[PDB]
Symmetry: D2
Subunit: 508 residues, 4 copies
């Protein structure tokens, strides 16, 4: 009964801290906060999501967090629960995702904090102090997860071993104002500069005019794009690196060039990543000078050249490839869309196809870039994005969430489609499966051979709408009404990829 | 190149230590020992198994280890690899499975040892000493995994950071003889005694005549069975507990009875588990006296009564339940079979149905009892068991491996069926899926509702033979020829389970 | 030889990062960076300090860090080295001290980072990239230790497993500008407010007029002191807590009062500590209103009352107590002094005696408040403070470092006085030992009995100047010339302490 | 109050498990089991030892454990307590010492087990089950510490977070019989064999006739000694290694000779240590054949030669060296003595001087071989050895405990002499301090210079009897009556050591 009083206080404070979604798995033991959780679900203060696979649950929670930017909880209930959530916790660490893991008695350094509540004790004499202690600890967990004081969001472990009021007007027990992390850096823009924008990059208005190689998940500061294929054809004297870029081969080459100084600008304190020649680190630039017009003209000309080369070789290729599918999805997007990209080929293919990400919410598990949970991540991101839209009060249909994943990723996370009728289901999620039987050392011997999985039969097993579509129909079909969740499968060829990429190189 | 010399030495010593199967996943980085591994595969000294899902790989390796009792390696190649192998490592710890995890730079206390090789250095002057160092370290890993000196087998982490001969006649570099762990315990059998035999129990000839409640995975010392339903109807004055029993409600009740002394006999040193009233611990019994004939008569009569009650209520029930399926499988078994049981309902249902396990190799992930990887465990156990049979030189068809799993377990580990044509596939594995849409706190709300997954469509997606069969046809169908892997689905009712179990209680 | 090239690069970058002092112990194995270290010592770029006791070495390094605010390294060389440095690492964590621990192959969560260099490899082809990699990693360690990006200084573990130029003009390889951590908090000063200033507090000009209970190590923002004995006699409606206050019983009472809202202002992001009723957290206050004159008058009157009570009962007491010694030291201080306080009685006694800390550098290991290493901390702080003074170029005698410790602390850290003639020794360190045979549960049974250690004989054993002095001579003797290190022992009574504190309470 | 019931049960079960001595430090918090502990002390069931230095406490506990072979507890009470006990825990791990660390809420892999009790709950309804649970957990801790089932004794962490009867006749709750760990190994003694006996070696009657190089702490199986200086002058074809030998340079050379097969015989399961050419491992030998008489004659002649060379160069040397002191102590010993050796020079010097260890209990912290706590180890070993003698009922004076340590070790652990009048003090401990100002890389620069500590003044500070004695008076003085604890200081020369060792080599 006191463990009941404690749980209701914790759940109430989590709700006050912005937690709207909680993920739960059936377990050997009663869940932490379980009766308090479904009571909050019954009263509409949160919504529970139940999954059987604990690894699935973590990636669902990741999607629920990245879809609208809120902290999300997962509650553990079994002897396999810690181990099964490992992968999502690693992703949440590297991608700085506010994932709160609830336990009721091992994650080591992956979490921002590991905090255990005191057991609930029968003592009406000090209900005031227990209530303050519990809500203060909950705000501690929330702050560590959201990076409210550290500007370094990430997963937190919150153990509760197994109703007094919170603050007035639904306020959090301990309020933490917006924190401003400032580290200004002098940069002279007259030196030939390229901006490399990676995962987690901030927005820099004073850099908007510079040639920018932006990863799909990086927000764009301006409108002077530089295609990644143009970069090896250029000789920048200076590089401004935003966030953590990892995608492109020519970026890794350039960032490792001791001849070229790199200025790393991050939104948080975590150390510049992949360049050993970082000259300095900061959060923003204090600029002098301006780029040479000849430098801008040369970069803009190289961008158009690289863009034309990819677009023309795609158009002239006789077979639909995964790159054609990525280009088709990119062309079909429009402001308001949420795009969820598999961390392998989709994110790279969309970058090579030259996606204009302005107006688009692009999500990809670029933290550790596994294919695990991509389906559940897309489902979670759709649910969280649609929930934010409904909260707006707009009468419109929910915004589209479009996921692009390969067949290997889809088949290995297909169990993420198993959602009970008792559970929330997206209203406007379309998963585009680029099916070529492949990926992208003896382990590669499986890639040389098709898995030959019947994707349509797989979707029918889960009673998810599936349609086999040609790449030219993808755009129109993405506008067509259908089930709240549906899979659009596009057959793609893998045998002509070397021919296609050789044609691109021959056109450059 | 020196890192190549090191890898070939390590792989050769692993082979000398009894490693026949190695599991590998495609990864961001080159695999540890990878070129040495496939070279050993090419020369037939081992066989590689490639999987994409790293969690799948671990449970496949578990099955490959428990099928014939040999040490098995898994080689890690990605940033998601440590986290994805957590669950299988926990199982290997609690089930004492010799699972060797290979890395090339976090498992904490789950492993018996965490050993890192020295980097391979260019130094022909001391090839003799490097070779001795590497092979000695490999025997260290092997011994820790197999419990060669500790009698406590389990997982080991072996890091190799990235050809000189071993001993003559294929011998291991450092030989470890059979270790005999002896802890004799005086027990007077004249006191009314019941034997409770759990997972990991040893064989005790001097206890064979006693009434024994044996879990399906426990080896039988004798032929005086006591059905678990008979136990609450009896008043033993003394309990001899073998291994780690966890299955039965009346066993937990009895083992927790402070009035009843418990003598724990284990094959290894790990501490008596679930009884707080363990009077003593040992490895074997030094017995005096003999059980009263009246005690044996009473236990044997209670056993027949409990057996008759379950069998009669099953026969009279109008609908096929999961218990009917478990009873059908048990009746179809014969000496030489390997039985693989899902860790939830199957192991309990087979126990309630009264399976005679003599002559049968019964496997179940009873270490932590998750449903994860049950399909891959069954596949691995079949492959290892059939490989041992082929090594025997017998011209016979391979022995049958029969797995019994629920539909929930099958659907959540169905991706274990995704095996490339380049990979080993069992010859005589039949997975029996007891499909009732259920399992066995708000998380349970999904159990009240069917998943409604089309299991036949799921198997067709993976191109695995599937047949929908009635429980009376199960026995004959299990004898029928088919694909090397096949699924037999038996539809079962979940709505009449309370009626069925009330009928059992009313007959007791 | 390559491991030599690596070490010289690391040491050079550490020097560029502000490391002036390195602590070293003789060990089973060659020290990390050892030949590079003494070469830097020979060229005057750093100075090495050699100690035999590894725990002593850590506290010496702490003092060397807190004396002038610089990062300090300790280099490990034995199988006892990790365990022996534990206590200083815990202190460095809680006190946010930039302590860099160097190893050459376990500290867990106590360190800000655990970073291992790559082994030095023979490869002139990429000396440019190795040099950038090593110096970048060193700046990473330095930044984590100093909190250059996190504003959360602390210990770091830096493993180097066992000359290319750095930046021009001695600059660090990766520059990190001053980081500004900002979290403004609205506070209305018209509400009756008291400021509680603890260890690690910042300076707040807009709070200078408020009644402030400041711990001895807290910097003073203003000149409106409130004696801690006055606090229970007052009824503040609001508390502004700066830093982490832990000292005073009435502070813990007030901070735990649910009726009183607490606003926590910290210089870094670490979470408000000892109050469960923290209403909000920030880094600075945005104030409105002003304190009532009646509130200021009442607090100032209560302060004078509490001050007079302590001073008068001390003057009238017939025996010298530890409190008399603390008051004598406080009265003898003057701007420019460094005061080092034992973490037990000295810091509390100096607070009760009402020390005016303006102009004084007050150090105390208030992180975890052990008595371990207080002598070596004082020695290290003196050496670092005097080294900063010499760098100034002032012809004056070095500033005084005065340490106040109890006899128990002195005897248990007396081996810190063992400094070889080959090692740096302070020029103006005076350790005042308040000797009453006591401290301040069956463990307390030793306090009831004197240790009876001859402190003078103890100092003579270490050939440290020692003088037995009466409390009235302490001030004049602290001005008298003597050895660079000397101990002034003041005999104090412990039997009349209850009488003295009862007299204080009777005067309040 | 329930936390009181729990503590009394735990302490009672610890006493039933053989715990006679408990070590305690005054702390920030109430000690775990504290009131139960002193109550057991008051009733004479245990004796408490109070120390202020937590590192001192651990080494005192080590000595209390190795003196008579019993499990010993240490109870932690402060925020510095975990870190300060690290070094003793490492020693206990490597030396396999049954050290039980009690906490009341981080040691990682150093401990055999980390076990936390359930909080004491107010529930008379199940006092029977709580009592069984607590006593069972205590026997679990005890068994893990003593290696009762694992034959691998070591430290254990036992957390109790903060009277029902145990078994009849003072028996332990869960009894664990003597465990026999058996791993027989075939060895042919006709091959030229030498036995190398190290720390932790067992006794092997069937090996007693073989030439044996025994470390001082190794028990002797026979009477055919081989001086370590004779080993490089011989060419054994086979080596039987007992325990973990680490002392001698020529042993490390021989054990690393790939040409020579090594058979490792250990009393427990831990893996053969320092030889990479271990051919096999076991616990005992099954022998065939017999050594050649010519081989025995050659080894015996080489032993006499090496013995004569050391003895003659010592006798002819003009100055007393540390080796002379070690030889003087060895010659003064007699059956019944306990010898405690500093882990640096003393253990090696006594080996070089050729000590006959038959009848002698030789202790040395050879686990990690630090000098820390050698004084407190000697004190603890004396107290435990004398307590066993008193339990025998013999009217004789207690047996002598003689410690041999260098001046560096004595000065750095001199605070171990600080023992309150409230605490147990040995009756017959004599510490012999071999004082030459030295030990045995820039860290060595302190060895070239004397510390010049006045050891006599140091002892007077602690009011420990100290006498400055010439090496020829050591034997007679060791027989002379004195205080229960006394220090005998022998001045030794360090400048003529190279001359002395060159004279030894010139005589070989």
């Amino acid at each position: 009964n006191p463990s009941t009083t404690q749980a209701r206080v914790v759940v109430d404070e989590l709700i006050r801290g912005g937690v709207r979604d909680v993920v739960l798995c059936p377990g050997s033991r009663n869940a932490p906060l379980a009766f308090a959780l479904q009571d909050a679900d019954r009263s509409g203060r949160i919504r529970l999501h139940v999954r059987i696979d604990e690894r699935t649950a973590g990636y669902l929670a990741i999607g629920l967090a990245i879809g609208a930017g809120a902290p999300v909880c997962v509650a553990m209930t079994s002897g396999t629960a810690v181990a099964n959530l490992g992968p999502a916790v690693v992703e949440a660490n590297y991608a700085r995702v506010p994932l709160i893991v609830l336990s009721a008695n091992y994650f080591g350094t992956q979490v921002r904090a590991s905090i255990s509540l005191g057991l609930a004790e029968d003592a009406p004499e000090r209900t005031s102090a227990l209530n303050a202690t519990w809500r203060s600890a909950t705000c501690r967990v929330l702050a560590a997860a959201t990076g409210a004081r550290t500007a370094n969001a990430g997963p937190v472990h919150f153990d509760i071993p197994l109703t007094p009021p919170g603050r007035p007007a639904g306020k959090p027990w301990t309020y933490t104002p917006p924190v401003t992390f400032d580290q200004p850096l002098d940069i002279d823009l007259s030196v030939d500069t390229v901006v490399i924008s990676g995962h987690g990059a901030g927005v820099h208005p004073n850099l908007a005019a510079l040639p920018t190689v932006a990863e799909p998940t990086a927000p764009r500061s301006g409108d002077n794009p530089l295609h990644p294929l143009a970069l090896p054809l250029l000789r920048p004297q200076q590089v401004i690196m935003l966030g953590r870029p990892t995608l492109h081969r020519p970026v890794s080459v350039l960032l490792a060039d001791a001849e070229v100084p790199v200025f790393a600008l991050t939104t948080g304190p975590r150390w510049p990543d992949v360049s050993g020649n970082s000259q300095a680190t900061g959060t923003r630039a204090v600029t002098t000078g301006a780029p040479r017009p000849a430098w801008l003209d040369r970069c803009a000309a190289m961008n158009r050249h690289a863009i034309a080369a990819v677009r023309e070789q795609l158009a002239a290729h006789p077979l639909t490839t995964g790159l054609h599918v990525a280009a088709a999805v990119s062309h079909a997007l429009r402001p308001g869309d949420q795009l969820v990209l598999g961390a392998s080929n989709p994110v790279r293919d969309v970058a090579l196809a030259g996606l204009d990400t302005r107006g688009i919410r692009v999500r990809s598990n670029r933290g550790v870039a596994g294919i695990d949970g991509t389906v559940s991540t897309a489902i979670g991101a759709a649910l969280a994005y649609e929930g934010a839209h409904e909260r707006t009060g707009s009468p419109d249909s929910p915004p589209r969430t479009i996921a692009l994943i390969g067949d290997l990723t889809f088949v290995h996370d297909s169990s993420g489609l198993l959602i009970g009728p008792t559970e929330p289901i997206p209203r406007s999620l379309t998963i585009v499966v680029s099916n070529d039987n492949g990926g992208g050392d003896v382990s590669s011997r499986i890639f040389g051979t098709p898995h030959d999985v019947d994707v349509g039969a797989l979707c029918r097993a889960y009673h998810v709408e599936s349609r086999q579509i040609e790449v030219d129909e993808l755009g129109p079909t993405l506008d067509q009404p259908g089930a709240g969740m549906r899979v659009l499968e596009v057959k793609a060829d893998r045998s002509s990829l070397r021919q296609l990429h050789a044609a691109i190189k021959a056109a450059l």
